[PDB]
Ligand binder design. Structure first.
Ligand SMILES: O=C(O)CNC(=O)C(=O)O
Ligand SMILES: [Mg+2]
Ligand code: NI
Ligand SMILES: [Zn+2]
Length: 331
């Protein structure tokens, strides 16, 4: 069995290997990359996502989210308070202000220490989940706006034609902005490209050990667990590496820098934080190996998780027994 310790793997495809996206994902899995839940892909030196980032300041962040924490430093939840719209230029200036800017630090490890020590005492503002793309239309390789759609994959594998679309999302981050512990909708893959700015640190649990994380989360968040049998779908809970280690939960960590891709694999729980002003683009995707994970994915039916139009068909076709209850949650 390849990669039996479930380490995060890093890949350096050549320009020729960068042509066929599906084939390269399958290659990475042949080497055991999925066992980690997360992989890094460094694009060939010949590749670029677009020519420059000099003209992005007029993008609108219609609903910036202030991430307010409650709990203790290593075990907390966050809720998202909606703020007034602002442009990317206005948000960059805010991120760089004395109130929000990254503190002086020695290296990524020192910054990680400061994040876990101090995150709860601040409420950074995240421009998340903005439909759109920063890939140039002429970029033909690993262009996250030109991937094969999940609806087309389900159709190719299973023969059923379904409604729905699949488009990318932009994330504008600042110091301390945080992504809570989650897997993707319907335990899909994700791919995330860091277009510009400061790094993003990731934590991940191997898919084969995801239920260990879930059992810890039920212990640590006991009211939330009683409210919903899949409350990590709410995407609000944080657990630090120190707490994970104290409870024996297998995980790994890695820092993504500008110009690098990350792939999350089906049922790979992940969480993380931004180091400073940055912009990422991400989208979900599927492969033939996903289908069995989609059929077994948990679902939130309490009403909190509320998701896209396109998840309807996935539930309806892959999980017909759950469909009625899940849809009641959506309405
Ligand atoms: O970058 C972020 O805030 C969150 N991204 C992801 O969870 C992902 O790409 O799957
Ligand atoms: Mg602009
Ligand atoms: Ni994710
Ligand atoms: Zn729920």
């Amino acid at each position: 069995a390849q990669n039996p310790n479930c380490n995060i793997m890093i890949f350096h495809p050549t320009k020729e290997e960068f042509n066929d996206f599906d084939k390269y994902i399958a290659y990475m899995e042949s080497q055991g990359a999925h066992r980690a839940g997360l992989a890094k892909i460094i694009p060939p030196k010949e590749w670029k996502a677009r020519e420059t980032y000099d003209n992005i300041s007029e993008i609108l962040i219609a609903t910036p989210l202030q991430q307010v924490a409650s709990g203790r430093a290593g075990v907390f939840t966050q809720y998202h308070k909606k703020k007034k719209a602002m442009t990317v230029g206005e948000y960059r200036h805010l991120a760089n202000s004395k109130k929000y800017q990254t503190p002086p630090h020695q290296n990524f490890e020192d910054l990680e220490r400061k994040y876990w020590k101090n995150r709860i005492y601040n409420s950074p503002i995240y421009g998340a989940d903005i439909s759109g793309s920063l890939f140039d239309e002429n970029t033909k390789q690993w262009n996250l706006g030109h991937l094969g759609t999940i609806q087309d994959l389900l159709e190719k594998e299973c023969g059923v034609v379904i409604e729905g679309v699949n488009t990318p999302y932009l994330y504008f981050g600042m110091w301390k902005t945080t992504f809570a512990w989650h897997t993707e909708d319907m335990d899909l893959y994700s791919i995330n490209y860091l277009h510009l700015g400061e790094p993003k640190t990731w934590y991940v649990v191997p898919p084969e050990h995801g239920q260990r994380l879930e059992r810890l989360a039920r212990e640590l968040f006991p009211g939330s667990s009683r409210g919903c049998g899949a409350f990590l779908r709410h995407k609000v809970a944080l657990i630090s590496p120190t707490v994970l280690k104290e409870n024996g939960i297998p995980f790994n960590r890695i820092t993504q820098e500008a110009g690098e891709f990350m792939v999350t694999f089906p049922y790979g729980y992940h969480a993380g934080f931004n180091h400073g002003f940055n912009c990422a683009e991400a989208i979900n995707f599927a492969t033939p190996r996903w289908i069995d994970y989609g059929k077994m994915a948990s679902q939130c039916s309490c009403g909190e998780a509320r998701v896209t139009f396109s998840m309807d068909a996935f539930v309806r076709i892959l999980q017909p027994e759950r469909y009625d209850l899940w849809k009641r949650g959506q309405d």
